[PDB]
């Protein structure tokens, strides 16, 4: 659970976190799990 | 000197935003500035006693 911080409708990153680093701009897939 | 600049040149894009490094204090221009001196004098010498 999140209180502060996240707001609704955003997206956050569950696949691909070795691959990224804030400040890029970048593709986007939902993921399965 | 130059192998420190090319670790801190791999080192850098790994680093959170808004972190940069910088390079204050330094001595290699001196001794680089002094060793070219020193060949510029030589080639004056060799060529002023031509």
């Known amino acids: 659970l999140v209180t502060e911080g996240l707001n609704a409708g955003d997206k956050i990153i569950t696949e691909g976190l070795q691959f990224v680093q804030p400040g890029v701009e970048v593709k986007t897939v939902p993921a399965k799990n | ?50």
């Not at chain 2, 808004?18 to 001196?30: A, E, I, L, N, R």
């Not at chain 2, 001794?31 to 010498?45: N, Q, R």
Request: a neutral charge.
């Open chain 2, 1 to 50: 000197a130059k192998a420190i600049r090319q670790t801190i040149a791999n080192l850098e894009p790994f680093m959170p935003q808004g972190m940069k490094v910088v390079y204050p204090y330094d001595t290699t221009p001196v001794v680089s500035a002094s060793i070219h001196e020193v060949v510029k004098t030589l080639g004056e010498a060799i060529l002023l006693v031509f």
